[PDB]
Paper text:
Within this class of proteins, the bromodomain and extraterminal domain (BET) family contains four members that are transcriptional coregulators and that recognize acetyllysines (AcKs) using a tandem pair of highly homologous bromodomains (BDs). Despite heavy academic and industry investment in this area, the generation of paralog-selective inhibitors has proved elusive because of the extremely high sequence similarity between the bromodomains of family members (90 to 95% within the acetyllysine-binding pocket residues). Crystal structures of 13 distinct peptide–bromodomain complexes revealed highly diverse structures and binding modes among the cyclic peptide ligands.
We selected the top two hits (members of BRD3-BD1 family 1 and BRD3-BD1 family 2, respectively, indicated in SI Appendix) as well as the shortest peptide in the top 50 (the seventh hit and a member of the most abundant family, BRD3-BD1 family 3, which accounts for 28% of total sequencing reads recovered for the top 500 peptides; SI Appendix, Fig. S3C) for detailed structural and functional studies. Among BD1 domains, peptides 3.1B and 3.1C displayed little selectivity, with affinities of each peptide for BRD2-BD1 and BRD4-BD1 within a factor of 2 to 4 of their affinity for BRD3-BD1, the domain against which they were selected. Five intermolecular hydrogen bonds are formed in the complex (including the BRD3-BD1 Asn116 and 3.1C AcK6 bond characteristic of bromodomain–AcK interactions) and 1,100 Å2 of surface area (across both molecules) is buried. This is low compared with known protein–protein complexes with the same affinity (1,500 to 2,500 Å2 is typical), pointing to the high binding efficiency that is accessible from cyclic peptide libraries of this type. Another notable feature of the structure is the high degree of internal hydrogen bonding observed for the peptide. The carbonyl group of Ile4 forms a bifurcated hydrogen bond with the amide protons of Val7 and Lys8, the Lys8 carbonyl is similarly hydrogen-bonded to the amide protons of Ile3 and Ile4, and the carbonyl of Trp1 forms a hydrogen bond with the amide of Gly10. In the structures with BD1 domains, this AcK lies within a channel formed between conserved Phe (in the loop following αZ) and Asp (αD) residues. All of the residues in all three structures that contact 3.1C are completely conserved, consistent with the very similar affinities observed by SPR.
Residue numbers in the entry:
A (entry chain A): 28 to 147
B (entry chain C): 1 to 11
Write the structure that this text describes.
Amino acid sequence: NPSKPGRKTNQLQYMQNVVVKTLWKHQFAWPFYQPVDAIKLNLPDYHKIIKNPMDMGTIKKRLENNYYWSASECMQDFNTMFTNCYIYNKPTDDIVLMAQALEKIFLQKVAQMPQEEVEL
Amino acid sequence: WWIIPKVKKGC
């Protein structure tokens, strides 16, 4: 949980208008649009193994509602989303390749992000 | 969508 009320910042606007937008448009992003539905997907022990679920739809909603105080918290949510995927799933699963491809784009956009955070 | 969830997609 954040330690301060959220803000609008140059870095958070970049996460919303560059990072989320570029990831969402790829045809392999769809498994990350919504929380993992472990009932419909019949995923045994998903919530026993994954204690902090996260998805890109939740991240997008948090950005639009100014939930985050800093883009560092948003980047951690993306990291949680990818790490959960690798922890729960099997090496040869389709989902792992899809996460790897999205995570590479995520890191590329983080490398290109403005390095200081200023409130808007 | 999934043929087998997480393992193999159908789309």
